């Protein structure tokens, strides 16, 4: 059980919910335009020591 949870299901539990963005175009009209300020954060590969 321990080896199975170390090898897999951890990369799965990361890639299930890793996405988080807050892209602020202008959040009101103008501001001309403003630009679609993609504040993007997400997690890729994981590591163990």
């Amino acid at each position: 059980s321990f080896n199975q949870f170390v090898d897999y299901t951890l990369q799965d539990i990361i890639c299930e919910d890793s996405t988080l963005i807050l892209e602020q175009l202008a959040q009101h009209t103008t501001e001309s335009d403003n630009i679609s300020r993609k504040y993007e954060i997400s997690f890729g590969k994981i590591y163990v020591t």
Binding site: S1, F2, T9, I13, I41
Partner: protein, 243 residues
């Protein structure tokens, strides 16, 4: 000789023990006692590894012992015990004999048909899917741009939350219909005593969990706590800077 899968916390050897439960996502039936208005029921547990614990209980209840032969069902988030012909029509099976073909399999037997005839007479009134879906089941949250209840809202319920197995995306209502028909079929077998009462105490219908699932559960929940704190301080950085 110290072959042992334990853990070393604070200078103490430390082991975890298995936990058990009934297996989820599998049919059971019960025979509740006589004085209650319910006689024969069923249940489905659920979990899909394991976002927001995915509990999502289900039951289908039965009335009478007599002339109260009716089959209502409950779903989240519906507080009313909904009769089931409504559910068939709402999922999109209008013509009556086809609901019958979804339920039973041998057309030559009939006892199921007299069992269901009062239920069809219950469903004699509503003849359209969105009219059926118009039944309220409020239970929160507040209405959006609606009239009484959005049919979009009801279909969103039936897609996203109900029956967290076979699908939850958009388009497999016929799989749902067959699954519910099989459930009704086994409930009717338990009611008509051709097939017997199930057992809760049999072993294979239970499961044993271990460190894998346990660390999975705790790690998921604290990861969600983590993620909500990640969303915290992202709104707070109205001012500088990107630390």
């Amino acid at each position: 000789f110290d072959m042992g899968g334990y853990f070393i916390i604070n200078g103490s050897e430390k082991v975890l023990i298995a936990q058990e439960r009934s297996a989820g996502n599998i049919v059971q039936v019960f025979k509740k006692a006589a004085p209650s208005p319910i006689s024969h029921v069923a249940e489905i547990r659920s979990a899909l590894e394991k976002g927001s614990r995915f509990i999502s209980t289900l039951q289908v209840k039965l009335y009478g012992r007599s002339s109260a032969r009716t089959i209502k069902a409950t779903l989240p988030y519906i507080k009313q015990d909904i009769p089931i012909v409504i559910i068939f029509r709402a999922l999109g099976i209008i013509p009556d004999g086809e609901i019958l073909e979804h339920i039973c399999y041998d057309v030559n037997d009939w006892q199921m048909l007299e069992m269901l005839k009062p239920c069809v007479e219950d469903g004699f009134v509503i003849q359209d899917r969105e009219t059926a879906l118009d039944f309220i089941g409020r239970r929160g949250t507040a209405l959006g741009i609606k009239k009484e209840k959005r049919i979009q809202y009801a279909k969103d319920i039936l897609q996203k939350e109900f029956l967290p197995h076979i699908t939850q995306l958009e388009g497999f209502e016929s799989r749902k219909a067959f699954f519910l028909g099989y459930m009704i079929n086994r409930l009717l077998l338990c009611a008509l005593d051709r097939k017997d009462q199930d057992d809760r105490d049999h072993f294979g219908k239970k499961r044993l969990d271990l460190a894998g699932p346990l660390l999975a559960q705790l790690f998921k929940t604290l990861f969600k706590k983590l993620t909500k704190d990640i969303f915290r301080y992202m709104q707070r950085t109205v001012e500088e800077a990107h630390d």
